């Protein structure tokens, strides 16, 4: 039995679930309450960070790393949707697991000009093993759509065109 702080997070999946079609039809919405581990990782500077930080808002958590072929191709979707909607209710947070080479996803980044997304980045790779641990994490990449109270909404194993319009339509529902 999950977490009841996470029942509205139920309701607005089955409220968005018509919507996860097309581009998006690889999202699975939640059927029961689940509220996420919180994750810690670190921001573009190595200052600490934790999902719970970003309370209050809707976000699009995603793991990412430059090792991972389709994660690279879908950054700039994701660089789009943060430019499209980040806001007071909103944002997207896309969390690097390289463990190798700290300057590599940065090098990345930055050739990519995909400046929007901060860079957020957990060099133990725990983030995924957290995720993988509740059964949301089935390989790379893997990204939550995540409700306000920190419970999950719907999860995708795999890329989407997170800039094309059926992905927006339902982000901006999950989102309002």
């Given at each position: 039995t999950?977490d009841?702080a996470?029942?509205?997070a ?13 581009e998006?039809?690889a999202?699975?919405?939640?059927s029961?309450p689940?509220?996420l ?20 808002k ?7 790393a430059?090792?991972?072929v389709?994660?690279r ?6 660089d ?5 909607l980040?806001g007071?209710?909103?944002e ?5 697991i ?7 996803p ?5 050739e990519?000009?995909?400046?929007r997304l901060g ?5 133990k790779?725990k ?8 059964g949301?994490?089935?390989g ?9 109270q920190?419970?999950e ?5 795999g890329?989407?065109?997170w ?5 927006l ?8």
């Amino acid at each position: 039995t999950g977490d009841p702080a996470c029942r509205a997070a139920v309701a607005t999946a089955q409220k968005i679930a018509p919507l996860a079609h097309g581009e998006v039809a690889a999202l699975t919405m939640a059927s029961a309450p689940l509220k996420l581990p919180d994750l810690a990782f670190e921001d573009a500077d190595g200052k600490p960070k934790k999902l719970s930080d970003f309370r209050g808002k809707t976000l699009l958590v995603n793991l990412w790393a430059t090792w991972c072929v389709p994660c690279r191709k879908e950054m700039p979707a994701l660089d789009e949707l943060q430019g499209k909607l980040s806001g007071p209710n909103f944002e997207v947070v896309a969390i690097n697991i390289d463990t190798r080479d700290p300057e590599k996803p940065k090098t990345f980044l930055k050739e990519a000009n995909l400046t929007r997304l901060g860079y957020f980045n957990d060099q133990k790779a725990k983030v995924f093993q957290d995720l993988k641990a509740i059964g949301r994490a089935l390989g790379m990449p893997t990204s939550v759509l995540v409700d306000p109270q920190g419970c999950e909404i719907a999860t995708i194993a795999g890329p989407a065109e997170w800039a094309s319009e059926d992905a927006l339509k339902l982000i901006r529902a999950a989102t309002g």
